[PDB]
Protein backbone atom coordinates (compact mmCIF):
# COMPACT_ATOMS: atom_id res chain seq x y z
CA UNK A 1 0.00 0.00 0.00
CA UNK A 2 1.78 3.04 -1.38
CA UNK A 3 1.46 5.52 1.49
CA UNK A 4 0.22 8.98 0.49
CA UNK A 5 2.00 11.62 2.60
CA UNK A 6 5.83 11.41 2.73
CA UNK A 7 8.86 13.69 3.22
CA UNK A 8 10.67 15.70 0.47
CA UNK A 9 12.40 19.06 -0.14
CA UNK A 10 9.73 21.59 0.87
CA UNK A 11 11.69 24.85 0.91
CA UNK A 12 9.02 27.58 1.08
CA UNK A 13 5.35 26.71 1.57
CA UNK A 14 4.82 28.80 4.71
CA UNK A 15 1.71 30.89 5.31
CA UNK A 16 1.66 34.11 7.31
CA UNK A 17 -1.60 35.12 8.98
CA UNK A 18 -2.30 38.44 10.73
CA UNK A 19 -5.72 37.41 12.00
CA UNK A 20 -6.60 40.06 14.55
CA UNK A 21 -4.81 43.27 15.56
CA UNK A 22 -1.18 42.21 15.25
CA UNK A 23 -1.83 38.50 15.91
CA UNK A 24 0.84 37.02 13.66
CA UNK A 25 0.96 33.25 13.27
CA UNK A 26 2.07 30.91 10.53
CA UNK A 27 1.38 27.46 9.09
CA UNK A 28 3.77 25.23 7.16
CA UNK A 29 1.13 23.88 4.76
CA UNK A 30 2.85 20.51 4.04
CA UNK A 31 3.32 19.68 7.71
CA UNK A 32 -0.27 20.65 8.50
CA UNK A 33 -1.72 18.17 6.09
CA UNK A 34 0.92 15.47 6.68
CA UNK A 35 -0.05 15.51 10.37
CA UNK A 36 -3.77 15.59 9.63
CA UNK A 37 -3.47 12.66 7.23
CA UNK A 38 -1.99 10.48 9.93
CA UNK A 39 -4.57 11.85 12.38
CA UNK A 40 -7.24 10.40 10.11
CA UNK A 41 -5.32 7.13 9.71
CA UNK A 42 -5.07 6.79 13.51
CA UNK A 43 -8.78 7.35 14.07
CA UNK A 44 -9.95 5.14 11.19
CA UNK A 45 -7.69 2.43 12.65
CA UNK A 46 -8.97 2.51 16.24
CA UNK A 47 -12.57 2.83 15.03
CA UNK A 48 -12.21 -0.11 12.60
CA UNK A 49 -12.84 -2.70 15.33
CA UNK A 50 -15.66 -2.76 17.89
CA UNK A 51 -13.32 -3.14 20.91
CA UNK A 52 -10.60 -0.53 20.15
CA UNK A 53 -13.12 2.31 20.09
CA UNK A 54 -12.38 3.24 23.66
CA UNK A 55 -8.85 4.50 22.94
CA UNK A 56 -10.34 7.65 21.36
CA UNK A 57 -9.19 9.49 24.51
CA UNK A 58 -5.70 8.00 24.32
CA UNK A 59 -5.29 8.97 20.66
CA UNK A 60 -6.40 12.53 21.37
CA UNK A 61 -3.89 12.51 24.21
CA UNK A 62 -1.06 11.46 21.90
CA UNK A 63 -1.90 13.88 19.07
CA UNK A 64 -2.28 16.85 21.43
CA UNK A 65 1.08 16.04 22.92
CA UNK A 66 2.60 16.04 19.47
CA UNK A 67 1.02 19.39 18.81
CA UNK A 68 2.42 20.77 22.03
CA UNK A 69 5.81 19.48 20.93
CA UNK A 70 5.39 20.96 17.48
CA UNK A 71 4.27 24.26 18.92
CA UNK A 72 7.35 24.31 21.14
CA UNK A 73 9.46 24.38 18.01
CA UNK A 74 7.43 27.21 16.58
CA UNK A 75 7.59 29.08 19.86
CA UNK A 76 11.39 29.07 19.49
CA UNK A 77 10.99 31.81 16.89
CA UNK A 78 8.44 34.03 18.68
CA UNK A 79 11.04 36.77 19.19
CA UNK A 80 11.70 37.18 15.48
CA UNK A 81 7.95 37.05 14.98
CA UNK A 82 7.38 39.84 17.48
CA UNK A 83 10.19 41.70 15.73
CA UNK A 84 8.16 41.55 12.54
CA UNK A 85 4.88 42.48 14.26
CA UNK A 86 6.29 45.81 15.41
CA UNK A 87 7.58 46.49 11.91
CA UNK A 88 4.15 45.85 10.47
CA UNK A 89 2.82 48.00 13.31
CA UNK A 90 4.98 50.83 11.99
CA UNK A 91 3.86 50.28 8.37
CA UNK A 92 0.09 49.97 8.90
CA UNK A 93 -0.07 52.90 11.35
CA UNK A 94 2.07 55.77 10.13
CA UNK A 95 1.37 58.06 13.11
CA UNK A 96 9.44 62.00 9.02
CA UNK A 97 10.62 58.55 7.88
CA UNK A 98 9.90 57.15 4.40
CA UNK A 99 8.42 54.09 2.70
CA UNK A 100 11.93 53.13 1.51
CA UNK A 101 13.38 52.61 5.00
CA UNK A 102 10.13 51.01 6.18
CA UNK A 103 9.62 48.67 3.22
CA UNK A 104 13.21 47.43 3.28
CA UNK A 105 12.90 46.95 7.05
CA UNK A 106 9.76 44.86 6.58
CA UNK A 107 11.37 42.64 3.94
CA UNK A 108 14.42 41.97 6.12
CA UNK A 109 12.41 41.02 9.21
CA UNK A 110 10.22 38.75 7.04
CA UNK A 111 13.20 36.98 5.47
CA UNK A 112 14.73 36.63 8.95
CA UNK A 113 11.63 34.82 10.21
CA UNK A 114 11.62 32.47 7.20
CA UNK A 115 15.33 31.76 7.78
CA UNK A 116 14.55 30.86 11.39
CA UNK A 117 11.95 28.36 10.19
CA UNK A 118 14.45 26.87 7.73
CA UNK A 119 17.02 26.36 10.49
CA UNK A 120 14.49 24.43 12.62
CA UNK A 121 13.13 22.20 9.82
CA UNK A 122 14.88 19.07 11.14
CA UNK A 123 13.18 19.53 14.53
CA UNK A 124 9.79 19.78 12.78
CA UNK A 125 10.58 16.75 10.63
CA UNK A 126 11.23 14.63 13.70
CA UNK A 127 7.79 15.38 15.21
CA UNK A 128 6.10 14.66 11.88
CA UNK A 129 8.00 11.37 11.60
CA UNK A 130 6.86 10.48 15.14
CA UNK A 131 3.26 10.96 14.01
CA UNK A 132 3.75 8.89 10.86
CA UNK A 133 5.29 6.08 12.94
CA UNK A 134 2.48 6.10 15.52
CA UNK A 135 -0.30 6.17 12.92
CA UNK A 136 1.22 3.63 10.56
CA UNK A 137 1.96 1.35 13.51
CA UNK A 138 -1.74 1.41 14.41
CA UNK A 139 -2.64 0.94 10.72
CA UNK A 140 -0.24 -1.96 10.11
CA UNK A 141 -1.81 -3.85 13.05
CA UNK A 142 -5.28 -3.35 11.50
CA UNK A 143 -6.94 -6.78 11.58
CA UNK A 144 -10.24 -8.05 10.21
CA UNK A 145 -12.95 -10.43 11.34
CA UNK A 146 -12.76 -12.23 7.99
CA UNK A 147 -10.08 -10.83 5.68
CA UNK A 148 -12.27 -11.26 2.60
CA UNK A 149 -15.31 -9.47 4.18
CA UNK A 150 -14.10 -6.34 6.00
CA UNK A 151 -16.83 -4.09 7.42
CA UNK A 152 -16.81 -0.46 6.27
CA UNK A 153 -18.71 0.91 9.26
CA UNK A 154 -15.35 2.21 10.49
CA UNK A 155 -15.31 4.57 7.50
CA UNK A 156 -18.96 5.45 8.04
CA UNK A 157 -18.40 6.27 11.70
CA UNK A 158 -15.21 8.24 11.02
CA UNK A 159 -16.86 10.28 8.27
CA UNK A 160 -20.06 10.88 10.26
CA UNK A 161 -18.26 12.11 13.39
CA UNK A 162 -15.15 13.72 11.87
CA UNK A 163 -16.00 14.97 8.40
CA UNK A 164 -19.75 15.35 7.70
CA UNK A 165 -20.36 18.33 9.98
CA UNK A 166 -17.74 20.19 7.99
CA UNK A 167 -19.01 19.36 4.51
CA UNK A 168 -22.34 20.82 5.61
CA UNK A 169 -20.68 23.80 7.33
CA UNK A 170 -18.73 24.54 4.13
CA UNK A 171 -21.83 24.53 1.95
CA UNK A 172 -23.58 26.75 4.58
CA UNK A 173 -21.49 29.92 4.04
CA UNK A 174 -21.50 30.02 0.20
CA UNK A 175 -17.73 30.29 -0.30
CA UNK A 176 -17.85 32.01 -3.66
CA UNK A 177 -20.11 34.83 -2.56
CA UNK A 178 -17.51 35.70 0.05
CA UNK A 179 -15.06 36.18 -2.85
CA UNK A 180 -17.45 38.19 -5.03
CA UNK A 181 -17.84 40.57 -2.10
CA UNK A 182 -14.08 40.65 -1.50
CA UNK A 183 -13.55 41.67 -5.13
CA UNK A 184 -16.29 44.27 -4.73
CA UNK A 185 -14.44 45.79 -1.75
CA UNK A 186 -11.13 45.82 -3.65
CA UNK A 187 -12.70 47.51 -6.68
CA UNK A 188 -14.30 50.10 -4.43
CA UNK A 189 -10.97 50.88 -2.75
CA UNK A 190 -9.31 51.32 -6.15
CA UNK A 191 -11.97 53.85 -7.14
CA UNK A 192 -12.11 55.63 -3.78
CA UNK A 193 -8.34 55.97 -3.72
CA UNK A 194 -8.17 57.46 -7.22
CA UNK A 195 -11.34 59.54 -6.78
CA UNK A 196 -9.69 60.96 -3.64
CA UNK A 197 -6.11 61.55 -4.92
CA UNK A 198 -6.15 65.18 -6.04
CA UNK A 199 -2.96 66.51 -4.41
CA UNK A 200 0.30 66.11 -2.52
CA UNK A 201 1.17 66.73 1.12
CA UNK A 202 -1.25 64.14 2.45
CA UNK A 203 1.00 61.44 0.94
CA UNK A 204 2.43 59.08 3.52
CA UNK A 205 -1.06 57.61 3.72
CA UNK A 206 -1.49 57.21 -0.03
CA UNK A 207 1.60 54.98 0.08
CA UNK A 208 0.35 52.94 3.03
CA UNK A 209 -3.16 52.59 1.59
CA UNK A 210 -1.71 51.22 -1.63
CA UNK A 211 0.43 48.79 0.38
CA UNK A 212 -2.61 47.52 2.32
CA UNK A 213 -4.56 47.20 -0.94
CA UNK A 214 -1.78 45.04 -2.38
CA UNK A 215 -1.48 42.78 0.67
CA UNK A 216 -5.28 42.44 0.63
CA UNK A 217 -5.21 41.22 -2.95
CA UNK A 218 -2.44 38.76 -2.11
CA UNK A 219 -4.60 37.38 0.70
CA UNK A 220 -7.54 37.33 -1.72
CA UNK A 221 -5.60 35.26 -4.29
CA UNK A 222 -4.95 32.73 -1.58
CA UNK A 223 -8.57 32.50 -0.37
CA UNK A 224 -9.44 32.12 -4.08
CA UNK A 225 -7.09 29.14 -4.44
CA UNK A 226 -8.21 27.45 -1.22
CA UNK A 227 -11.91 27.88 -1.98
CA UNK A 228 -11.19 26.23 -5.33
CA UNK A 229 -9.73 23.17 -3.62
CA UNK A 230 -12.52 23.08 -1.02
CA UNK A 231 -15.11 23.15 -3.81
CA UNK A 232 -13.59 20.26 -5.74
CA UNK A 233 -12.70 18.16 -2.66
CA UNK A 234 -16.21 18.47 -1.19
CA UNK A 235 -17.53 16.89 -4.39
CA UNK A 236 -14.84 14.20 -4.62
CA UNK A 237 -15.32 13.37 -0.92
CA UNK A 238 -19.08 12.94 -1.26
CA UNK A 239 -18.66 11.03 -4.54
CA UNK A 240 -16.17 8.53 -3.07
CA UNK A 241 -17.81 8.16 0.37
CA UNK A 242 -20.90 6.82 -1.44
CA UNK A 243 -18.84 3.82 -2.66
CA UNK A 244 -17.01 2.83 0.58
CA UNK A 245 -19.93 2.98 3.06
CA UNK A 246 -22.57 0.20 2.85
CA UNK A 247 -20.59 -2.88 1.80
CA UNK A 248 -17.47 -4.96 2.43
CA UNK A 249 -13.97 -5.18 0.96
CA UNK A 250 -11.06 -7.57 1.01
CA UNK A 251 -8.42 -6.37 3.49
CA UNK A 252 -6.11 -5.03 0.76
CA UNK A 253 -8.91 -2.99 -0.85
CA UNK A 254 -10.17 -1.78 2.54
CA UNK A 255 -6.71 -0.45 3.44
CA UNK A 256 -6.20 1.16 0.02
CA UNK A 257 -9.65 2.75 0.41
CA UNK A 258 -8.84 4.13 3.87
CA UNK A 259 -5.63 5.70 2.57
CA UNK A 260 -7.49 7.29 -0.36
CA UNK A 261 -10.22 8.74 1.87
CA UNK A 262 -7.66 10.01 4.41
CA UNK A 263 -5.74 11.77 1.62
CA UNK A 264 -8.93 13.49 0.44
CA UNK A 265 -9.94 14.59 3.95
CA UNK A 266 -6.44 15.71 4.94
CA UNK A 267 -6.32 18.09 2.00
CA UNK A 268 -9.90 19.36 2.37
CA UNK A 269 -9.40 20.13 6.06
CA UNK A 270 -6.03 21.82 5.52
CA UNK A 271 -7.17 24.35 2.94
CA UNK A 272 -10.47 24.94 4.78
CA UNK A 273 -8.53 25.87 7.93
CA UNK A 274 -6.35 28.28 5.98
CA UNK A 275 -9.27 29.66 3.99
CA UNK A 276 -10.88 30.83 7.21
CA UNK A 277 -7.67 32.22 8.70
CA UNK A 278 -7.00 34.31 5.58
CA UNK A 279 -10.58 35.51 5.58
CA UNK A 280 -9.82 36.78 9.09
CA UNK A 281 -6.72 38.65 7.93
CA UNK A 282 -8.50 40.14 4.91
CA UNK A 283 -11.07 41.83 7.04
CA UNK A 284 -8.59 42.83 9.75
CA UNK A 285 -6.76 44.81 7.06
CA UNK A 286 -10.09 46.09 5.69
CA UNK A 287 -11.08 47.58 9.04
CA UNK A 288 -7.70 49.26 9.16
CA UNK A 289 -8.36 50.74 5.72
CA UNK A 290 -11.42 52.52 7.08
CA UNK A 291 -9.24 54.22 9.73
CA UNK A 292 -6.50 55.30 7.34
CA UNK A 293 -9.00 56.64 4.80
CA UNK A 294 -10.72 58.61 7.52
CA UNK A 295 -7.39 60.05 8.69
CA UNK A 296 -6.55 60.99 5.09
CA UNK A 297 -9.64 63.22 4.88
CA UNK A 298 -8.36 65.28 7.81
CA UNK A 299 -5.15 66.39 6.07
CA UNK A 300 -7.28 66.65 2.94
CA UNK A 301 -8.85 69.95 4.02
CA UNK A 302 -5.73 70.93 6.05
CA UNK A 303 -3.71 71.44 2.90
CA UNK A 304 -7.08 72.23 1.26
Amino acid sequence: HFKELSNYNIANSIDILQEKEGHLDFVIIPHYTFLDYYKHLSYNSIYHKSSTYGKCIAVDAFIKKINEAYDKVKSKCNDIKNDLIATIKKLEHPYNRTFKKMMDEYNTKKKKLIKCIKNHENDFNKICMDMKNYGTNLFEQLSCYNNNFCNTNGIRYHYDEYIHKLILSVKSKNLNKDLSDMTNILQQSELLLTNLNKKMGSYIYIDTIKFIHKEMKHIFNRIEYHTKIINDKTKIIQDKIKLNIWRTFQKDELLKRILDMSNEYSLFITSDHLRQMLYNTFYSKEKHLNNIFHHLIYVLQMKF
Partner: antibody, heavy 120, light 109 residues
Framework: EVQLVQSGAEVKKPGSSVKVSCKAS????????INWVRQAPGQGLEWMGG????????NYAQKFQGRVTITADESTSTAYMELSSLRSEDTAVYFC?????????????WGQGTMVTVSS | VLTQPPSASGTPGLRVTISCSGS????????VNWYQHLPGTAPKLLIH???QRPSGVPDRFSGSKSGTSASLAISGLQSEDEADYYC???????????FGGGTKLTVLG
Protein backbone atom coordinates in the same frame (compact mmCIF):
# COMPACT_ATOMS: atom_id res chain seq x y z
CA GLU B 1 -35.59 16.60 18.32
CA VAL B 2 -36.21 14.58 15.17
CA GLN B 3 -39.62 12.92 15.21
CA LEU B 4 -40.53 10.07 12.89
CA VAL B 5 -44.14 9.26 11.96
CA GLN B 6 -45.34 6.50 9.66
CA SER B 7 -48.18 7.68 7.44
CA GLY B 8 -50.98 5.11 7.28
CA ALA B 9 -52.56 1.68 7.48
CA GLU B 10 -53.49 -0.53 4.54
CA VAL B 11 -55.33 -3.54 3.09
CA LYS B 12 -54.16 -5.17 -0.14
CA LYS B 13 -54.68 -8.30 -2.23
CA PRO B 14 -52.03 -10.95 -3.03
CA GLY B 15 -49.72 -9.86 -5.81
CA SER B 16 -50.40 -6.14 -5.46
CA SER B 17 -47.87 -3.54 -4.30
CA VAL B 18 -47.86 -1.23 -1.29
CA LYS B 19 -45.92 1.93 -0.45
CA VAL B 20 -45.53 3.09 3.15
CA SER B 21 -44.09 6.48 4.04
CA CYS B 22 -42.06 7.77 6.97
CA LYS B 23 -41.82 11.51 7.54
CA ALA B 24 -39.15 13.33 9.51
CA SER B 25 -40.75 16.04 11.61
CA UNK B 26 -37.59 17.83 12.68
CA UNK B 27 -37.21 18.76 9.02
CA UNK B 28 -33.68 17.66 8.19
CA UNK B 29 -32.38 14.40 6.77
CA UNK B 30 -29.15 14.32 8.78
CA UNK B 31 -26.23 12.05 7.92
CA UNK B 32 -28.16 9.33 9.72
CA UNK B 33 -29.85 6.39 8.08
CA ILE B 34 -33.57 5.59 8.16
CA ASN B 35 -34.14 1.83 8.33
CA TRP B 36 -37.19 -0.35 7.87
CA VAL B 37 -38.00 -3.28 10.16
CA ARG B 38 -41.14 -5.39 10.08
CA GLN B 39 -42.85 -7.81 12.44
CA ALA B 40 -45.32 -10.42 11.29
CA PRO B 41 -47.62 -11.87 13.97
CA GLY B 42 -45.55 -14.55 15.66
CA GLN B 43 -42.29 -13.70 13.86
CA GLY B 44 -40.41 -10.97 15.79
CA LEU B 45 -38.57 -8.00 14.35
CA GLU B 46 -36.97 -8.57 10.93
CA TRP B 47 -34.67 -5.99 9.36
CA MET B 48 -35.59 -5.21 5.75
CA GLY B 49 -33.22 -2.51 4.54
CA GLY B 50 -32.18 1.06 5.02
CA UNK B 51 -31.44 4.21 3.10
CA UNK B 52 -29.11 7.06 3.90
CA UNK B 53 -31.14 10.00 2.60
CA UNK B 54 -28.43 12.60 2.12
CA UNK B 55 -26.30 10.18 0.03
CA UNK B 56 -29.19 8.18 -1.57
CA UNK B 57 -27.42 4.85 -0.74
CA UNK B 58 -29.54 1.74 0.02
CA ASN B 59 -28.98 -1.62 1.79
CA TYR B 60 -31.36 -4.62 1.78
CA ALA B 61 -31.81 -7.78 3.85
CA GLN B 62 -31.08 -10.62 1.49
CA LYS B 63 -34.28 -12.64 2.00
CA PHE B 64 -36.26 -9.48 1.00
CA GLN B 65 -33.91 -8.07 -1.61
CA GLY B 66 -35.78 -8.57 -4.89
CA ARG B 67 -39.14 -7.42 -3.51
CA VAL B 68 -38.43 -4.24 -1.51
CA THR B 69 -37.39 -0.85 -2.88
CA ILE B 70 -36.59 1.99 -0.46
CA THR B 71 -36.38 5.63 -1.60
CA ALA B 72 -36.33 9.07 -0.01
CA ASP B 73 -37.23 12.75 -0.30
CA GLU B 74 -34.70 15.49 0.35
CA SER B 75 -37.14 18.40 0.00
CA THR B 76 -40.33 17.07 1.61
CA SER B 77 -38.37 15.16 4.31
CA THR B 78 -39.91 11.73 3.82
CA ALA B 79 -38.64 8.22 3.04
CA TYR B 80 -40.64 5.45 1.36
CA MET B 81 -40.70 1.65 1.38
CA GLU B 82 -42.35 -0.21 -1.51
CA LEU B 83 -43.07 -3.93 -1.42
CA SER B 84 -44.24 -5.66 -4.60
CA SER B 85 -45.80 -9.08 -5.21
CA LEU B 86 -47.43 -9.14 -1.77
CA ARG B 87 -47.96 -12.57 -0.19
CA SER B 88 -50.11 -13.63 2.74
CA GLU B 89 -46.99 -13.98 4.92
CA ASP B 90 -46.37 -10.25 4.36
CA THR B 91 -49.21 -9.26 6.70
CA ALA B 92 -47.22 -7.43 9.37
CA VAL B 93 -46.44 -4.16 11.14
CA TYR B 94 -43.82 -2.08 9.31
CA PHE B 95 -41.59 0.32 11.31
CA CYS B 96 -39.18 3.06 10.23
CA UNK B 97 -36.27 3.93 12.53
CA UNK B 98 -33.32 6.29 12.65
CA UNK B 99 -29.90 5.02 13.62
CA UNK B 100 -27.38 6.91 15.78
CA UNK B 101 -23.69 6.86 14.89
CA UNK B 102 -22.47 7.79 18.38
CA UNK B 103 -24.52 4.88 19.79
CA UNK B 104 -22.97 2.26 17.47
CA UNK B 105 -25.73 2.93 14.92
CA UNK B 106 -28.46 1.65 17.23
CA UNK B 107 -32.06 2.55 16.33
CA UNK B 108 -32.97 5.26 18.85
CA UNK B 109 -35.98 6.91 17.14
CA TRP B 110 -38.86 4.81 15.82
CA GLY B 111 -41.97 5.58 13.83
CA GLN B 112 -45.31 4.48 15.24
CA GLY B 113 -45.69 1.63 12.73
CA THR B 114 -47.93 0.82 9.76
CA MET B 115 -50.18 -2.24 9.63
CA VAL B 116 -50.31 -3.98 6.24
CA THR B 117 -52.94 -6.71 5.83
CA VAL B 118 -52.84 -8.96 2.74
CA SER B 119 -56.02 -10.98 2.19
CA SER B 120 -58.34 -12.18 -0.57
CA VAL C 1 -30.13 -15.41 13.19
CA LEU C 2 -29.29 -14.81 16.85
CA THR C 3 -30.75 -17.32 19.32
CA GLN C 4 -32.68 -16.19 22.42
CA PRO C 5 -34.97 -18.18 24.72
CA PRO C 6 -38.56 -17.83 23.50
CA SER C 7 -39.82 -17.06 27.01
CA ALA C 8 -38.54 -16.13 30.46
CA SER C 9 -40.12 -15.63 33.86
CA GLY C 10 -39.16 -13.75 37.00
CA THR C 11 -40.40 -12.84 40.47
CA PRO C 12 -40.97 -9.16 41.34
CA GLY C 13 -37.92 -7.56 42.87
CA LEU C 14 -35.47 -10.28 41.96
CA ARG C 15 -33.17 -10.69 38.98
CA VAL C 16 -33.83 -12.27 35.62
CA THR C 17 -31.15 -12.79 32.72
CA ILE C 18 -31.87 -13.23 29.02
CA SER C 19 -29.19 -14.87 26.87
CA CYS C 20 -28.34 -14.25 23.21
CA SER C 21 -26.10 -16.58 21.19
CA GLY C 22 -24.37 -15.58 17.96
CA SER C 23 -21.31 -16.26 15.81
CA UNK C 24 -17.86 -14.89 15.10
CA UNK C 25 -19.29 -12.90 12.17
CA UNK C 26 -21.84 -10.90 14.20
CA UNK C 27 -21.49 -10.79 18.01
CA UNK C 28 -17.92 -12.06 17.75
CA UNK C 29 -16.93 -8.90 15.88
CA UNK C 30 -19.56 -6.13 16.21
CA UNK C 31 -21.65 -4.66 18.96
CA VAL C 32 -24.95 -6.09 20.22
CA ASN C 33 -27.91 -3.83 20.97
CA TRP C 34 -31.02 -4.50 23.03
CA TYR C 35 -34.58 -3.38 22.39
CA GLN C 36 -37.78 -3.58 24.45
CA HIS C 37 -41.06 -4.00 22.54
CA LEU C 38 -44.66 -3.89 23.77
CA PRO C 39 -46.99 -4.68 20.81
CA GLY C 40 -49.13 -1.69 20.00
CA THR C 41 -45.98 0.40 20.60
CA ALA C 42 -42.77 0.95 18.68
CA PRO C 43 -39.76 -1.04 19.92
CA LYS C 44 -37.64 0.84 22.44
CA LEU C 45 -33.86 0.99 22.57
CA LEU C 46 -32.57 -0.35 25.90
CA ILE C 47 -28.82 -0.72 25.18
CA HIS C 48 -27.01 1.03 22.33
CA UNK C 49 -23.56 -0.40 23.06
CA UNK C 50 -21.81 -3.21 24.93
CA UNK C 51 -22.72 -2.42 28.54
CA GLN C 52 -24.34 0.94 27.80
CA ARG C 53 -27.89 2.31 27.97
CA PRO C 54 -29.49 5.57 26.79
CA SER C 55 -30.86 8.21 29.13
CA GLY C 56 -34.22 7.15 30.54
CA VAL C 57 -33.29 3.47 30.89
CA PRO C 58 -33.05 2.61 34.62
CA ASP C 59 -29.86 1.36 36.15
CA ARG C 60 -31.56 -2.08 36.63
CA PHE C 61 -30.77 -2.97 33.00
CA SER C 62 -27.26 -4.18 32.19
CA GLY C 63 -25.82 -5.77 29.07
CA SER C 64 -22.75 -7.87 28.61
CA LYS C 65 -20.76 -9.56 25.88
CA SER C 66 -18.22 -12.40 25.92
CA GLY C 67 -17.00 -13.91 22.66
CA THR C 68 -20.00 -14.86 20.51
CA SER C 69 -22.59 -14.42 23.27
CA ALA C 70 -24.33 -11.59 25.06
CA SER C 71 -26.67 -11.33 28.02
CA LEU C 72 -29.19 -8.87 29.42
CA ALA C 73 -29.68 -8.67 33.18
CA ILE C 74 -32.73 -7.06 34.78
CA SER C 75 -32.61 -6.49 38.53
CA GLY C 76 -35.42 -5.32 40.81
CA LEU C 77 -38.02 -6.69 38.39
CA GLN C 78 -41.15 -4.51 38.06
CA SER C 79 -44.49 -5.06 36.35
CA GLU C 80 -43.63 -2.45 33.73
CA ASP C 81 -40.90 -4.86 32.54
CA GLU C 82 -43.46 -7.28 31.06
CA ALA C 83 -42.62 -7.22 27.34
CA ASP C 84 -40.74 -8.78 24.45
CA TYR C 85 -36.96 -8.34 24.41
CA TYR C 86 -34.82 -8.48 21.27
CA CYS C 87 -31.05 -8.51 20.78
CA UNK C 88 -29.53 -7.34 17.50
CA UNK C 89 -26.08 -7.19 15.95
CA UNK C 90 -24.46 -6.32 12.66
CA UNK C 91 -23.44 -9.39 10.64
CA UNK C 92 -20.24 -9.01 8.61
CA UNK C 93 -20.91 -12.11 6.48
CA UNK C 94 -24.43 -10.96 5.57
CA UNK C 95 -23.51 -7.25 5.48
CA UNK C 96 -26.62 -6.47 7.45
CA UNK C 97 -28.52 -6.41 10.71
CA UNK C 98 -29.57 -9.69 12.36
CA PHE C 99 -31.94 -10.02 15.30
CA GLY C 100 -32.33 -12.32 18.13
CA GLY C 101 -35.50 -14.25 18.64
CA GLY C 102 -37.89 -12.51 21.00
CA THR C 103 -37.87 -13.61 24.62
CA LYS C 104 -41.30 -12.96 26.12
CA LEU C 105 -41.03 -11.88 29.76
CA THR C 106 -43.59 -12.86 32.06
CA VAL C 107 -43.64 -10.78 35.24
CA LEU C 108 -45.21 -13.22 37.70
CA GLY C 109 -48.24 -11.75 39.45
Amino acid sequence: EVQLVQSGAEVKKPGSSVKVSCKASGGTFSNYAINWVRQAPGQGLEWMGGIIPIFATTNYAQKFQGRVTITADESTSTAYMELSSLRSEDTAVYFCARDKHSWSYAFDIWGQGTMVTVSS
Amino acid sequence: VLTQPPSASGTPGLRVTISCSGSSSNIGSNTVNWYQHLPGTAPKLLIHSNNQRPSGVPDRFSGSKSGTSASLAISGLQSEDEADYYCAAWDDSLNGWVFGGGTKLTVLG
